[PDB]
Each structure stands twice: as structure tokens, then as C-alpha cells.
Ligand binder design. Structure first.
Ligand code: D6S
Length: 330
């Protein structure tokens, strides 16, 4: 089998991407944030505290003839940005872009933090990291990808995120028309449950490439590119007037600036992030200070190749027995 679904930015800044997902019988379509940095599929639901729902589409398991309570199972997750959610669990039929999994754990939110409530366009998350990170207790549950894997033509999914435009998540096949040149594959460590890999270095604009190992994770659920402070300082030093602002929470730059590109290494290959991708606009409406798309990872504990990096590439998440990651230009 295969699946193919379009993923769409939630706003004009590409802050996140939503992908339609069919849950239950008859189908209830929810728009979920596909997140290669976590491993829970959870949704706003008829069980979510009423005051914490503001415009989201909810899953109502009582209206699904294939929904079954996973008795005794609960979940609770806290993300790196300080957001959180928790609840109980159903199993149900879940389809993404024509690919169907029966008996998928659908984690029903009873509680969500303010950041989720305030985002009316995101009806839940669909985790695509390794199932070892799944928070369901006392019986850990598998991701949609893990459940689908044996049935897929190939045990892979791909992320093809657009810049200020829709893109595509494919399951079970590699669309050879979707990228230019060749795909360069690189080793993955699953020791922390992430798609963790090591970039071979970086360049700023037309500058010389710096060969240096940068360990990080491929995370579609993170908006920006988080890299070591040395790297990030070298980038913003090429933008007149750019500075790190404690009050704002990162590097800002004059909105009148033209941003340089940023290149990162994948083995001997190079992925170029255009400067425009690194612009996240005025810090507040009408401000002439703009927020940077490359930020320091120093306060995170891990480097994160988020959407700013990933949208510059065609990315293969290879879930073979020994997983790997592939990057191509496009
Ligand atoms: C749950 N977050 C997305 C989100 C979606 C909607 C509202 C608020 C936040 C992020 C969070 O920031 C980085 C990391 O954790 C990421 N893997 C996760 O997807």
C-alpha cells in the first residue's frame, strides 16, 4: 500500500503545517500537525474540557462505529516549547491520503495547554518519531507509521514541505519526480527515539563551507532551525543590525535587511536554505524588528532541523531495520 496527502501551512509564516486525517466510521476528518519529533497521535475531542476548545474540529468517538475504548490507558505529554496535553485512548480506523490503519491508538484529549487552544487551525498532532517515545500508559502504543509499515510497498515516508505553499507527505514510496539530483542518505541514531543524524557542516551565504559535525534531529513539528550558538552567531553576524534580544527570546534583525542563505551539509551533499526562508516577520504588528528563523539551541539540549531547514529539501524518513534519513534538493 501507499498513501499521499497534501500538507498546508497554517498561516503566512509557515508556523506549522496541517494535513487532513480521516478518523473513525463514518470518517471524521481532522487537520493534524504531522510531527517527526514526537510519537503520539492525539486529537481535540468531545472529551476535551469545553473552555479549552476554541474553533478546533473535534473527534467524537461515540459517533464512530469502529471506535473502542482502550480500557485503562491514559496519556500525558509535554513538549519542548512548554505545551502539553493529556487524556485517555481509543483505538479506531485512521486513514492518511488513502492509506488505512485499523486499530490505531487515537489519544483523546481531556486537557490541552493554552498554546493548543489558541491555535484554531490545529486539531491535534500525528507523531512520526519512534514508538519508544509514545506516552500511553500502561501499554505503550505504536505510531501510525509503525502500524502501517509492514503493509507499505516500502517502509518509508517522505516530507516535502513548501515555502509559503502547500507540500506533500507520502507513505510507502519515493516520488522520483519531486526532487532534483540525487538523494543523499545519512545514518540515524534511534537512541533518543528521534530521527537523529549528524550534519557535516555549514556555510553562510556565499562563504566557505565549514566542516564540522552537528548532531541534531529532523523535526517537522518544530518551526525553526536551532543550531549551536557558534553557528548561529556566525550567521547573524552577516546581517547588519541583527542581535540577540533577551526580551524577544532570540535573534531579531531589521526588517529592511536582505538575509543571506544558509547551507547545511548532508554527507558530501549540500542543502541550501534561501535567505527568505529565514524571515519570520515583524515581532509584533507594525514593528520594524523581524524575528529570525535560525536560533540558538543552547537552551534546548539538542540541535533541531525544523521546518526552516526541512522545507528546503525533499526528505526521506527510511524506517528500514536500520533507519536512515535522505535529503535531496528540489
Ligand atoms: C507541540 N508543538 C507544536 C505545536 C502545535 C500547536 C500548538 C502549539 C505547539 C511542538 C513543540 O515545539 C517543538 C517540539 O515541541 C515539536 N516536536 C512539537 O511539535
Amino acid at each position: 500500500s501507499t498513501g499521499s496527502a497534501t500538507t498546508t501551512p497554517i498561516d503566512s509564516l509557515d508556523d506549522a503545517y496541517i494535513t487532513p486525517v480521516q478518523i473513525g466510521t463514518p470518517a471524521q476528518t481532522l487537520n493534524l500537525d504531522f510531527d517527526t519529533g514526537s510519537s503520539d497521535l492525539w486529537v481535540f475531542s468531545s472529551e476535551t474540557t469545553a473552555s479549552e476548545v476554541d474553533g478546533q474540529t473535534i473527534y467524537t468517538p461515540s459517533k464512530s462505529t469502529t471506535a473502542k475504548l482502550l480500557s485503562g490507558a491514559t496519556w500525558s505529554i509535554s513538549y519542548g516549547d512548554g505545551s502539553s496535553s493529556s487524556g485517555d485512548v481509543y483505538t479506531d480506523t485512521v486513514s492518511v491520503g488513502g492509506l488505512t490503519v485499523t486499530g490505531q491508538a487515537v489519544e483523546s484529549a481531556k486537557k490541552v495547554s493554552s498554546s493548543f487552544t489558541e491555535d484554531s487551525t490545529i486539531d491535534g498532532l500525528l507523531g512520526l518519531a519512534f514508538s519508544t517515545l509514545n506516552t500511553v500508559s500502561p501499554t505503550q502504543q505504536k505510531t501510525f507509521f509503525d502500524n502501517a509499515k509492514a503493509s507499505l510497498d516500502s517502509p518509508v515516508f517522505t516530507a516535502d514541505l513548501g515555502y509559503h505553499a502547500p507540500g506533500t507527505y507520502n507513505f510507502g514510496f519515493i516520488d522520483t519526480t519531486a526532487y532534483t539530483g540525487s538523494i543523499t542518505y545519512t545514518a540515524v541514531s534511534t537512541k533518543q527515539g528521534f530521527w537523529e543524524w549528524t550534519s557535516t557542516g555549514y556555510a553562510v551565504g556565499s562563504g566557505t563551507f565549514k566542516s564540522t559535525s552537528i548532531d541534531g534531529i529532523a523535526d517537522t513539528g518544530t518551526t525553526l532551525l536551532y543550531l549551536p550558538a557558534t553557528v548561529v552567531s556566525a550567521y547573524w553576524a552577516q546581517v547588519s543590525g541583527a542581535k540577540s534580544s533577551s526580551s524577544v527570546g532570540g535573534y531579531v534583525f531589521p526588517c529592511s535587511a536582505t538575509l543571506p542563505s544558509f547551507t547545511f551539509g548532508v554527507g558530501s551533499a549540500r542543502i541550501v536554505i534561501p535567505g527568505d526562508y529565514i524571515d519570520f516577520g515583524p515581532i509584533s504588528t507594525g514593528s520594524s524588528s523581524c524575528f529570525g528563523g535560525i536560533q540558538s539551541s543552547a537552551g534546548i539540549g539538542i540541535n533541531i532541523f525544523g521546518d526552516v531547514a526541512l522545507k528546503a529539501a525533499f526528505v526521506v524518513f527510511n524506517g528500514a531495520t536500520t533507519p536512515t534519513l535522505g535529503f535531496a534538493s528540489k
